[PDB]
Amino acid sequence: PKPVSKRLVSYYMCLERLLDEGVEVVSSEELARRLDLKASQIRKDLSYFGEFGKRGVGYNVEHLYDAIGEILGVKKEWKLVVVGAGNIGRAVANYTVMKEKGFRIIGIFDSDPSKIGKEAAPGLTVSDVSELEKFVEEHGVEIGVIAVPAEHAQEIAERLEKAGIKGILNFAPVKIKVSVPVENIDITASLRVLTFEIVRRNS
Amino acid sequence: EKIPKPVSKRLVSYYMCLERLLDEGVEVVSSEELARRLDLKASQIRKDLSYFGEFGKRGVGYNVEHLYDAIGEILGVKKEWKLVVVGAGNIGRAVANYTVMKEKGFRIIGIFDSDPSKIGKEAAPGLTVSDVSELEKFVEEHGVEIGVIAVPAEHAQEIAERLEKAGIKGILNFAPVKIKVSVPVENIDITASLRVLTFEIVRRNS
């Protein structure tokens, strides 16, 4: 389901962060503190990799990071479009890290004539939203990013579904209802998680 | 407010569970339903939730809204939080105009940018962008508790060091760097959300 995918990505991000610190062996307790999770749950998940995932008395950071990365398919590239050339849409098209990880934005769209024709990023010009459905099907786009206001999120999501999209990354504060998977971005949820750790420490 | 870790761990679990119940339109929940979604004994739920008396009960079950307000109150997170945004670019402007923040009690009382051509602009209705030199003074004078880092990766660790010396209580970071500060830091990374998305896409194809 959704939680096991989030944990697997959590493990991957944490192990990558552990490798940058020079750590080669990590314990389930240390992973518990970094991911805010039970240690027994971590040992239950990582037993999938057997002895290959172990080193010393803890876990082989390098082996787990490599195996999970192959499970997550980090080598594959993905074609993305962004609907909405506002503040969020411009930030996504200018996000240097996304292009490095294989998430290629080949098109960005908007409904405002003042933004159409201009450049959202180097090599990417804003296209009319009326051409979004043909653009998705012509380039075989897999992922669409919804960066339009709330009241147009569901409509854009449905046109992506009709055009053959495979998944949606949604910024708009609406519950998108489609038959493709959806990942919602909610910085308010990240803020709430931050407030919990603030009151625990500051008290 | 001395709350033990085993008790505090369940309150946040209740809190997160009750939050989804409100977004599901649920007004009344039973101890057995809470047991089903929390993987805790129903005898434990009724033991914990009796702390709120009749105020937490509604009909034959529990008042989801009253319990959500009271548990967030005990955890100390229901209060309004004063926020500042460092960086008035694309991310900073979108954060400054985000409606859902104000509804959940995250009020941005100031935004900062080191660009002289940007200083003085509006960015969002009801607020003015300021010079980053006065970030320490603004955080100290207004008691800002959460700082949002929307600066490029090059100046990100320095911004987090200034907020720590100014007395910030937390940091929301967008920049793609490892923030090395003693204050708690929460990082936003849509590539992680994309990795979750692509993994689910591939599994459905298989």
Ligand SMILES: NC(=O)C1=CN([C@@H]2O[C@H](COP(=O)(O)OP(=O)(O)OC[C@H]3O[C@@H](n4cnc5c(N)ncnc54)[C@H](O)[C@@H]3O)[C@@H](O)[C@H]2O)C=CC1
């Ligand atoms: N998930 C989160 O944490 C946050 C959510 N948001 C949401 O992201 C979305 C956009 O945010 P901003 O960039 O700050 O606002 P914005 O106004 O700068 O961007 C909106 C863009 O979408 C275009 N647009 C409007 N209707 C359209 C349609 N049917 N089709 C194509 N394009 C259309 C507009 O021309 C405009 O350029 C909003 O829904 C906002 O609530 C904003 C900040 C963070």
Ligand SMILES: NC(=O)C1=CN([C@@H]2O[C@H](COP(=O)(O)OP(=O)(O)OC[C@H]3O[C@@H](n4cnc5c(N)ncnc54)[C@H](O)[C@@H]3O)[C@@H](O)[C@H]2O)C=CC1
């Ligand atoms: N976590 C995620 O998923 C994503 C992260 N980002 C990151 O957010 C940050 C901002 O991105 P954008 O706003 O889209 O680009 P941007 O170029 O529009 O934002 C830069 C702004 O920060 C200002 N600035 C530069 N140095 C500063 C300093 N020392 N102090 C205060 N302000 C300073 C600049 O004057 C400019 O206004 C970047 O680090 C970016 O990598 C961007 C997209 C999504």
